[PDB]
Amino acid sequence: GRRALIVLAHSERTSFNYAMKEAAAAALKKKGWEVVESDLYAMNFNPIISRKDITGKLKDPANFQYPAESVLAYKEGHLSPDIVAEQKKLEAADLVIFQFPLQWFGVPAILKGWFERVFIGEFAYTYAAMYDKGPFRSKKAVLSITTGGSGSMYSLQGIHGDMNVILWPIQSGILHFCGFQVLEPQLTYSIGHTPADARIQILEGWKKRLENIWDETPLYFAPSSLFDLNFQAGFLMKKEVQDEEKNKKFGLSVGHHLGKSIPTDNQIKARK
Amino acid sequence: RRALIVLAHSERTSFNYAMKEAAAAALKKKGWEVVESDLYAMNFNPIISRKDITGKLKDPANFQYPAESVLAYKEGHLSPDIVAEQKKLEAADLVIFQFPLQWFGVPAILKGWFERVFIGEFAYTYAAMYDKGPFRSKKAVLSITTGGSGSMYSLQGIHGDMNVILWPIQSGILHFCGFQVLEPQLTYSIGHTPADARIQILEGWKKRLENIWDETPLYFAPSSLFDLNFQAGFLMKKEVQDEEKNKKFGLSVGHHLGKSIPTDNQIKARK
Ligand SMILES: Cc1cc2nc3c(=O)[nH]c(=O)nc-3n(C[C@H](O)[C@H](O)[C@H](O)COP(=O)(O)OP(=O)(O)OC[C@H]3O[C@@H](n4cnc5c(N)ncnc54)[C@H](O)[C@@H]3O)c2cc1C
Ligand SMILES: Cc1cc2nc3c(=O)[nH]c(=O)nc-3n(C[C@H](O)[C@H](O)[C@H](O)COP(=O)(O)OP(=O)(O)OC[C@H]3O[C@@H](n4cnc5c(N)ncnc54)[C@H](O)[C@@H]3O)c2cc1C
Ligand SMILES: COC1=CC(=O)c2c(c(COc3ccc([N+](=O)[O-])cc3)c(C)n2C)C1=O
Ligand SMILES: COC1=CC(=O)c2c(c(COc3ccc([N+](=O)[O-])cc3)c(C)n2C)C1=O
């Protein structure tokens, strides 16, 4: 059971992405979940950050700083109402699913904009409680991505390079930074070259996984307990921890590779 | 030569805007012809949709952005705003992307600019990816400002290696289309920098631009190291794979090959 929010970033209801969104909703409701949606295109979602995101009067209108004005607005209760509606959905959700086609090695601009306007300071993150200590530490997020390129193109020896590197900015930088436990991504490669029968099994496999999604062990990110969370330290790994690592073959993550070997599928398989 | 400066910041009072003005002035003084794409000031629409095609859609029942926008490109049915931006790019020798780092990437308005402007056949072909892309005779540079300090983005910083963050953008978007990518201008913790230090940052950016074109670009594995076809799955050539197994470092951030990533592969030039 519990509550789920599904954020979809695709303009066509005829797309495989829409089908993936529908499959997820059905599988989840079937197991007793309450499922809420944020179909960004359907909502004509405004993905462009601006001073209009603040309803009240600004602190410094002549020198507008989005981070500070937006935070203050969140605290005093005067963020644009469309933003607040999304924030209420997030707060209510236990599980958050992001369904979208990979576009230029990342998330669609409309979803990127959703993050930029909705993940406001204090609400989504606090510099005092980063990553694992973030506001969404009790939530779990999952990326469900469809790709045009084949899986081989994204393997260690494929022309595009390792998919784990592509996933990092998003899963660690956005999701985990806010405290989310990030689950293994659902990657559906070359969906434009997949047989009808295979497409059918993909939707059933997704529904199948969603039946026990909550109990999955999340992807591995270096705990914040390993860093000196303070300015005059530079937020660098603590002294002792850096020493203990000197003799270790592997780095900790994609981002924390430390100049050494990145554990296999660190951002794809959550078994580390 | 001709330069295009794409800026993604809503405030005329920002440092990013300042940086844009510095670049335009520096380049002009050296004889460059400078064009601008102030996305916010252009009231730019960053959302891809069928509205990007003015002509008749091949298949309106099942809209596929890639195939339709490519057909529109060839037949001349692309939205007027995209056409104007593609013309700016076509003429530009150097493209500067000036923006503040937002959620470990480019602003949504800029991500959308790429999505709507970098149309198939125009900006790339599945045949001539990367090395052989349409923009191989052009050079691109990212000038980024961040809220976090430089140490936060070091191999030991809590955010992790900035080189990993830059990869998706510099390789996946820029180099994929052919661009030779120059070293990124990284301006860290611009909000905790004394007024005197910012003036220097502006001056440092301007002097760099004086010889920007003669810079050694970032290293990306050449397409010749791969068997470019589904038959081979676009993987490195067997010879390469074997001849590489004796190397300590991988080829790049993306092609780390499970080994050590060459230091500052996406920040400093050194093949
Ligand atoms: C701007 C842009 C940038 C891109 N950048 C990249 C990139 O960097 N890397 C990359 O790899 N790819 C990239 N792509 C390609 C993109 O990732 C794929 O085109 C997309 O993921 C395909 O997903 P889709 O939902 O649109 O599917 P669709 O193309 O619609 O295809 C779905 C397929 O499944 C069928 N189908 C639909 N509904 C169902 C259902 N209910 N049951 C069974 N079958 C069904 C459809 O008829 C069709 O055959 C980009 C595309 C764009 C537009
Ligand atoms: C949605 C969102 C997400 C973000 N995500 C991240 C992230 O993932 N990582 C990260 O590190 N940061 C992040 N940031 C922070 C962002 O990168 C910084 O706030 C931004 O880079 C600061 O640049 P700016 O141009 O806005 O400058 P401003 O804040 O305006 O600051 C410029 C400073 O220089 C002064 N100045 C202006 N013009 C001039 C001039 N001509 N000469 C000298 N001084 C001048 C100004 O008065 C001011 O003190 C995010 C911000 C937002 C809004
Ligand atoms: C509609 O699909 C695609 C549309 C794109 O707009 C796109 C793709 C890719 C990468 O995926 C590829 C798949 C196959 C080949 N190929 O050589 O045949 C090349 C690239 C990239 C980066 N872009 C910007 C697609 O696949
Ligand atoms: C306006 O600046 C910032 C605004 C942001 O919206 C933001 C920052 C960062 C990371 O940069 C940091 C800088 C300093 C601290 N700190 O210890 O106080 C923490 C984070 C991230 C991810 N976001 C989403 C900023 O800096």
Side-chain angles (χ1 to χ4, degrees), chain A residues 162-194:
Chain A
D162 186 18
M163 175 57 81
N164 285 278
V165 168
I166 298 173
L167 295 174
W168 174 263
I170 304 171
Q171 303 186 321
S172 177
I174 306 177
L175 304 177
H176 196 52
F177 178 78
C178 299
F180 272 115
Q181 271 163 267
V182 188
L183 309 182
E184 304 190 335
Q186 191 69 6
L187 302 168
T188 85
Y189 291 110
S190 40
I191 185 60
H193 299 298
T194 305

mmCIF file of all heavy atoms in Angstrom, chain A residues 162-194:
data_model
loop_
_atom_site.group_PDB
_atom_site.id
_atom_site.type_symbol
_atom_site.label_atom_id
_atom_site.label_comp_id
_atom_site.label_asym_id
_atom_site.label_seq_id
_atom_site.Cartn_x
_atom_site.Cartn_y
_atom_site.Cartn_z
ATOM 1 N N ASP A 162 29.225 4.818 -20.736
ATOM 2 C CA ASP A 162 28.496 4.217 -19.626
ATOM 3 C C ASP A 162 27.237 4.973 -19.160
ATOM 4 O O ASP A 162 27.302 6.145 -18.775
ATOM 5 C CB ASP A 162 29.479 4.028 -18.462
ATOM 6 C CG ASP A 162 28.879 3.288 -17.286
ATOM 7 O OD1 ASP A 162 27.833 2.615 -17.437
ATOM 8 O OD2 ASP A 162 29.488 3.369 -16.198
ATOM 9 N N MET A 163 26.099 4.279 -19.203
ATOM 10 C CA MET A 163 24.814 4.827 -18.770
ATOM 11 C C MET A 163 24.874 5.238 -17.294
ATOM 12 O O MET A 163 24.169 6.153 -16.873
ATOM 13 C CB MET A 163 23.703 3.783 -18.992
ATOM 14 C CG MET A 163 22.312 4.170 -18.476
ATOM 15 S SD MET A 163 21.679 5.705 -19.168
ATOM 16 C CE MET A 163 21.051 5.141 -20.742
ATOM 17 N N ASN A 164 25.710 4.565 -16.507
ATOM 18 C CA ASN A 164 25.849 4.901 -15.088
ATOM 19 C C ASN A 164 26.315 6.346 -14.887
ATOM 20 O O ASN A 164 25.939 6.997 -13.914
ATOM 21 C CB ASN A 164 26.837 3.955 -14.407
ATOM 22 C CG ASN A 164 26.258 2.588 -14.170
ATOM 23 O OD1 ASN A 164 25.542 2.365 -13.198
ATOM 24 N ND2 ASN A 164 26.553 1.660 -15.071
ATOM 25 N N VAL A 165 27.145 6.837 -15.802
ATOM 26 C CA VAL A 165 27.651 8.208 -15.729
ATOM 27 C C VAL A 165 26.527 9.196 -16.061
ATOM 28 O O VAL A 165 26.415 10.256 -15.445
ATOM 29 C CB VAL A 165 28.852 8.419 -16.702
ATOM 30 C CG1 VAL A 165 29.169 9.900 -16.831
ATOM 31 C CG2 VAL A 165 30.087 7.667 -16.173
ATOM 32 N N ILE A 166 25.696 8.828 -17.030
ATOM 33 C CA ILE A 166 24.564 9.648 -17.446
ATOM 34 C C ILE A 166 23.522 9.756 -16.328
ATOM 35 O O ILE A 166 22.952 10.830 -16.100
ATOM 36 C CB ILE A 166 23.876 9.051 -18.683
ATOM 37 C CG1 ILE A 166 24.848 9.026 -19.858
ATOM 38 C CG2 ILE A 166 22.627 9.859 -19.032
ATOM 39 C CD1 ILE A 166 24.300 8.306 -21.078
ATOM 40 N N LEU A 167 23.281 8.645 -15.632
ATOM 41 C CA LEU A 167 22.290 8.598 -14.547
ATOM 42 C C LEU A 167 22.699 9.364 -13.287
ATOM 43 O O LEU A 167 21.853 9.909 -12.578
ATOM 44 C CB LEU A 167 21.985 7.136 -14.164
ATOM 45 C CG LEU A 167 21.308 6.192 -15.171
ATOM 46 C CD1 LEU A 167 21.247 4.764 -14.623
ATOM 47 C CD2 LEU A 167 19.902 6.699 -15.456
ATOM 48 N N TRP A 168 23.999 9.420 -13.025
ATOM 49 C CA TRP A 168 24.523 10.077 -11.831
ATOM 50 C C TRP A 168 24.036 11.499 -11.521
ATOM 51 O O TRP A 168 23.533 11.747 -10.426
ATOM 52 C CB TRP A 168 26.059 10.044 -11.852
ATOM 53 C CG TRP A 168 26.681 10.815 -10.725
ATOM 54 C CD1 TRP A 168 27.156 12.096 -10.769
ATOM 55 C CD2 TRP A 168 26.857 10.368 -9.375
ATOM 56 N NE1 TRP A 168 27.618 12.474 -9.528
ATOM 57 C CE2 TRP A 168 27.445 11.434 -8.654
ATOM 58 C CE3 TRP A 168 26.575 9.167 -8.701
ATOM 59 C CZ2 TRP A 168 27.756 11.340 -7.295
ATOM 60 C CZ3 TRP A 168 26.888 9.076 -7.342
ATOM 61 C CH2 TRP A 168 27.472 10.158 -6.660
ATOM 62 N N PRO A 169 24.168 12.441 -12.473
ATOM 63 C CA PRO A 169 23.723 13.814 -12.212
ATOM 64 C C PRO A 169 22.298 13.883 -11.687
ATOM 65 O O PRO A 169 21.971 14.719 -10.846
ATOM 66 C CB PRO A 169 23.850 14.487 -13.581
ATOM 67 C CG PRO A 169 24.948 13.727 -14.240
ATOM 68 C CD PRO A 169 24.604 12.304 -13.875
ATOM 69 N N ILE A 170 21.458 12.985 -12.185
ATOM 70 C CA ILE A 170 20.049 12.951 -11.803
ATOM 71 C C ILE A 170 19.760 12.212 -10.502
ATOM 72 O O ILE A 170 19.158 12.771 -9.585
ATOM 73 C CB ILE A 170 19.202 12.304 -12.922
ATOM 74 C CG1 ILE A 170 19.425 13.050 -14.238
ATOM 75 C CG2 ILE A 170 17.720 12.324 -12.543
ATOM 76 C CD1 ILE A 170 18.814 12.353 -15.430
ATOM 77 N N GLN A 171 20.192 10.959 -10.419
ATOM 78 C CA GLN A 171 19.925 10.161 -9.236
ATOM 79 C C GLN A 171 20.638 10.650 -7.998
ATOM 80 O O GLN A 171 20.066 10.630 -6.911
ATOM 81 C CB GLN A 171 20.249 8.690 -9.514
ATOM 82 C CG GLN A 171 19.462 8.163 -10.719
ATOM 83 C CD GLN A 171 19.623 6.669 -10.951
ATOM 84 O OE1 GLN A 171 20.718 6.111 -10.789
ATOM 85 N NE2 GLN A 171 18.539 6.019 -11.346
ATOM 86 N N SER A 172 21.873 11.104 -8.149
ATOM 87 C CA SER A 172 22.615 11.607 -7.001
ATOM 88 C C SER A 172 22.409 13.103 -6.806
ATOM 89 O O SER A 172 22.028 13.549 -5.726
ATOM 90 C CB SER A 172 24.113 11.335 -7.159
ATOM 91 O OG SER A 172 24.834 11.889 -6.065
ATOM 92 N N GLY A 173 22.654 13.871 -7.860
ATOM 93 C CA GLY A 173 22.532 15.319 -7.775
ATOM 94 C C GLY A 173 21.168 15.893 -7.452
ATOM 95 O O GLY A 173 21.064 16.879 -6.729
ATOM 96 N N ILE A 174 20.117 15.290 -7.992
ATOM 97 C CA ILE A 174 18.769 15.773 -7.746
ATOM 98 C C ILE A 174 18.026 14.967 -6.680
ATOM 99 O O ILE A 174 17.666 15.488 -5.615
ATOM 100 C CB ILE A 174 17.937 15.763 -9.051
ATOM 101 C CG1 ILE A 174 18.683 16.546 -10.134
ATOM 102 C CG2 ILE A 174 16.558 16.381 -8.807
ATOM 103 C CD1 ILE A 174 18.005 16.563 -11.480
ATOM 104 N N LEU A 175 17.817 13.687 -6.956
ATOM 105 C CA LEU A 175 17.071 12.835 -6.048
ATOM 106 C C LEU A 175 17.694 12.579 -4.680
ATOM 107 O O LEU A 175 17.073 12.857 -3.650
ATOM 108 C CB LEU A 175 16.769 11.506 -6.743
ATOM 109 C CG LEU A 175 16.015 11.712 -8.059
ATOM 110 C CD1 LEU A 175 15.803 10.370 -8.732
ATOM 111 C CD2 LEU A 175 14.680 12.415 -7.788
ATOM 112 N N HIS A 176 18.915 12.056 -4.659
ATOM 113 C CA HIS A 176 19.559 11.754 -3.391
ATOM 114 C C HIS A 176 19.919 13.004 -2.605
ATOM 115 O O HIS A 176 19.845 13.011 -1.375
ATOM 116 C CB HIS A 176 20.802 10.892 -3.609
ATOM 117 C CG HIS A 176 21.290 10.231 -2.358
ATOM 118 N ND1 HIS A 176 20.463 9.485 -1.547
ATOM 119 C CD2 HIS A 176 22.508 10.220 -1.768
ATOM 120 C CE1 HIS A 176 21.149 9.045 -0.508
ATOM 121 N NE2 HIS A 176 22.393 9.477 -0.618
ATOM 122 N N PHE A 177 20.315 14.060 -3.304
ATOM 123 C CA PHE A 177 20.657 15.306 -2.633
ATOM 124 C C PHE A 177 19.512 15.753 -1.720
ATOM 125 O O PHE A 177 19.754 16.319 -0.656
ATOM 126 C CB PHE A 177 20.962 16.400 -3.660
ATOM 127 C CG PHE A 177 21.288 17.735 -3.046
ATOM 128 C CD1 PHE A 177 22.545 17.977 -2.506
ATOM 129 C CD2 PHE A 177 20.334 18.744 -2.995
ATOM 130 C CE1 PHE A 177 22.846 19.206 -1.924
ATOM 131 C CE2 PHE A 177 20.627 19.976 -2.415
ATOM 132 C CZ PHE A 177 21.884 20.207 -1.879
ATOM 133 N N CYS A 178 18.277 15.479 -2.141
ATOM 134 C CA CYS A 178 17.081 15.841 -1.380
ATOM 135 C C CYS A 178 16.688 14.777 -0.351
ATOM 136 O O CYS A 178 15.667 14.904 0.331
ATOM 137 C CB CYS A 178 15.911 16.103 -2.338
ATOM 138 S SG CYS A 178 16.206 17.468 -3.511
ATOM 139 N N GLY A 179 17.496 13.721 -0.253
ATOM 140 C CA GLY A 179 17.240 12.676 0.719
ATOM 141 C C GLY A 179 16.611 11.392 0.217
ATOM 142 O O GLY A 179 16.554 10.407 0.948
ATOM 143 N N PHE A 180 16.126 11.399 -1.017
ATOM 144 C CA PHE A 180 15.501 10.218 -1.594
ATOM 145 C C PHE A 180 16.408 9.004 -1.579
ATOM 146 O O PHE A 180 17.621 9.109 -1.775
ATOM 147 C CB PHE A 180 15.162 10.440 -3.066
ATOM 148 C CG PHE A 180 13.834 11.052 -3.312
ATOM 149 C CD1 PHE A 180 13.742 12.315 -3.884
ATOM 150 C CD2 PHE A 180 12.667 10.358 -3.020
ATOM 151 C CE1 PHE A 180 12.503 12.879 -4.162
ATOM 152 C CE2 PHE A 180 11.430 10.916 -3.295
ATOM 153 C CZ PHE A 180 11.351 12.172 -3.863
ATOM 154 N N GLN A 181 15.801 7.850 -1.352
ATOM 155 C CA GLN A 181 16.510 6.593 -1.453
ATOM 156 C C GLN A 181 16.166 6.356 -2.920
ATOM 157 O O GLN A 181 14.997 6.421 -3.299
ATOM 158 C CB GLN A 181 15.855 5.522 -0.596
ATOM 159 C CG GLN A 181 16.368 5.470 0.818
ATOM 160 C CD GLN A 181 15.427 4.712 1.702
ATOM 161 O OE1 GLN A 181 14.545 5.299 2.344
ATOM 162 N NE2 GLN A 181 15.574 3.393 1.723
ATOM 163 N N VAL A 182 17.168 6.137 -3.755
ATOM 164 C CA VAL A 182 16.898 5.938 -5.163
ATOM 165 C C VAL A 182 16.967 4.449 -5.480
ATOM 166 O O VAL A 182 17.939 3.768 -5.144
ATOM 167 C CB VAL A 182 17.914 6.733 -6.034
ATOM 168 C CG1 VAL A 182 17.510 6.681 -7.499
ATOM 169 C CG2 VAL A 182 18.000 8.176 -5.547
ATOM 170 N N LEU A 183 15.919 3.943 -6.113
ATOM 171 C CA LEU A 183 15.873 2.539 -6.471
ATOM 172 C C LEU A 183 16.470 2.361 -7.857
ATOM 173 O O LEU A 183 16.682 3.335 -8.588
ATOM 174 C CB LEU A 183 14.428 2.047 -6.450
ATOM 175 C CG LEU A 183 13.649 2.363 -5.169
ATOM 176 C CD1 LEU A 183 12.263 1.767 -5.279
ATOM 177 C CD2 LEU A 183 14.379 1.799 -3.949
ATOM 178 N N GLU A 184 16.754 1.111 -8.211
ATOM 179 C CA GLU A 184 17.320 0.797 -9.515
ATOM 180 C C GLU A 184 16.420 1.361 -10.597
ATOM 181 O O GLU A 184 15.201 1.242 -10.527
ATOM 182 C CB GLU A 184 17.425 -0.714 -9.713
ATOM 183 C CG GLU A 184 18.205 -1.431 -8.650
ATOM 184 C CD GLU A 184 18.478 -2.875 -9.025
ATOM 185 O OE1 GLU A 184 17.707 -3.441 -9.837
ATOM 186 O OE2 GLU A 184 19.455 -3.443 -8.496
ATOM 187 N N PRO A 185 17.016 1.982 -11.619
ATOM 188 C CA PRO A 185 16.216 2.552 -12.704
ATOM 189 C C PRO A 185 15.629 1.464 -13.596
ATOM 190 O O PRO A 185 16.223 0.404 -13.749
ATOM 191 C CB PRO A 185 17.224 3.426 -13.450
ATOM 192 C CG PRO A 185 18.519 2.657 -13.276
ATOM 193 C CD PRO A 185 18.455 2.254 -11.810
ATOM 194 N N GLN A 186 14.451 1.717 -14.153
ATOM 195 C CA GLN A 186 13.837 0.771 -15.077
ATOM 196 C C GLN A 186 14.284 1.315 -16.433
ATOM 197 O O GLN A 186 13.834 2.376 -16.866
ATOM 198 C CB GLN A 186 12.307 0.791 -14.959
ATOM 199 C CG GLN A 186 11.609 -0.355 -15.686
ATOM 200 C CD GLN A 186 11.848 -1.714 -15.034
ATOM 201 O OE1 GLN A 186 12.449 -1.809 -13.973
ATOM 202 N NE2 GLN A 186 11.363 -2.773 -15.671
ATOM 203 N N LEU A 187 15.211 0.610 -17.080
ATOM 204 C CA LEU A 187 15.741 1.053 -18.364
ATOM 205 C C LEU A 187 15.200 0.234 -19.518
ATOM 206 O O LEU A 187 15.427 -0.974 -19.586
ATOM 207 C CB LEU A 187 17.283 0.986 -18.360
ATOM 208 C CG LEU A 187 17.997 1.814 -17.277
ATOM 209 C CD1 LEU A 187 19.474 1.421 -17.210
ATOM 210 C CD2 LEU A 187 17.837 3.317 -17.568
ATOM 211 N N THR A 188 14.477 0.888 -20.421
ATOM 212 C CA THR A 188 13.946 0.190 -21.581
ATOM 213 C C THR A 188 14.605 0.800 -22.828
ATOM 214 O O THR A 188 14.201 1.858 -23.326
ATOM 215 C CB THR A 188 12.399 0.281 -21.636
ATOM 216 O OG1 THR A 188 11.999 1.492 -22.274
ATOM 217 C CG2 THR A 188 11.832 0.249 -20.238
ATOM 218 N N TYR A 189 15.650 0.115 -23.295
ATOM 219 C CA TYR A 189 16.450 0.530 -24.442
ATOM 220 C C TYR A 189 15.832 0.295 -25.824
ATOM 221 O O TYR A 189 15.049 -0.643 -26.019
ATOM 222 C CB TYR A 189 17.793 -0.184 -24.388
ATOM 223 C CG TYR A 189 18.697 0.245 -23.261
ATOM 224 C CD1 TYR A 189 18.955 -0.603 -22.191
ATOM 225 C CD2 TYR A 189 19.371 1.457 -23.313
ATOM 226 C CE1 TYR A 189 19.874 -0.262 -21.206
ATOM 227 C CE2 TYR A 189 20.293 1.809 -22.335
ATOM 228 C CZ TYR A 189 20.543 0.944 -21.290
ATOM 229 O OH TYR A 189 21.492 1.276 -20.351
ATOM 230 N N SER A 190 16.218 1.147 -26.776
ATOM 231 C CA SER A 190 15.753 1.079 -28.160
ATOM 232 C C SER A 190 14.298 0.653 -28.284
ATOM 233 O O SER A 190 13.975 -0.318 -28.972
ATOM 234 C CB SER A 190 16.651 0.137 -28.975
ATOM 235 O OG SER A 190 17.025 -1.019 -28.235
ATOM 236 N N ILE A 191 13.418 1.401 -27.630
ATOM 237 C CA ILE A 191 11.999 1.077 -27.645
ATOM 238 C C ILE A 191 11.396 1.243 -29.038
ATOM 239 O O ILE A 191 10.335 0.689 -29.341
ATOM 240 C CB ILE A 191 11.240 1.949 -26.605
ATOM 241 C CG1 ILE A 191 9.779 1.520 -26.526
ATOM 242 C CG2 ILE A 191 11.372 3.412 -26.955
ATOM 243 C CD1 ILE A 191 9.609 0.078 -26.102
ATOM 244 N N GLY A 192 12.081 2.003 -29.884
ATOM 245 C CA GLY A 192 11.607 2.217 -31.239
ATOM 246 C C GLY A 192 11.949 1.068 -32.172
ATOM 247 O O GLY A 192 11.505 1.037 -33.323
ATOM 248 N N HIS A 193 12.740 0.118 -31.674
ATOM 249 C CA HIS A 193 13.159 -1.050 -32.446
ATOM 250 C C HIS A 193 12.768 -2.352 -31.753
ATOM 251 O O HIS A 193 13.342 -3.404 -32.032
ATOM 252 C CB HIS A 193 14.677 -1.041 -32.633
ATOM 253 C CG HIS A 193 15.190 0.147 -33.383
ATOM 254 N ND1 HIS A 193 14.835 0.414 -34.688
ATOM 255 C CD2 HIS A 193 16.044 1.132 -33.016
ATOM 256 C CE1 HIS A 193 15.449 1.512 -35.094
ATOM 257 N NE2 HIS A 193 16.190 1.967 -34.098
ATOM 258 N N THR A 194 11.797 -2.282 -30.849
ATOM 259 C CA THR A 194 11.368 -3.461 -30.109
ATOM 260 C C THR A 194 10.070 -4.081 -30.634
ATOM 261 O O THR A 194 9.056 -3.396 -30.781
ATOM 262 C CB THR A 194 11.189 -3.120 -28.622
ATOM 263 O OG1 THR A 194 12.400 -2.552 -28.120
ATOM 264 C CG2 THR A 194 10.870 -4.356 -27.825
#
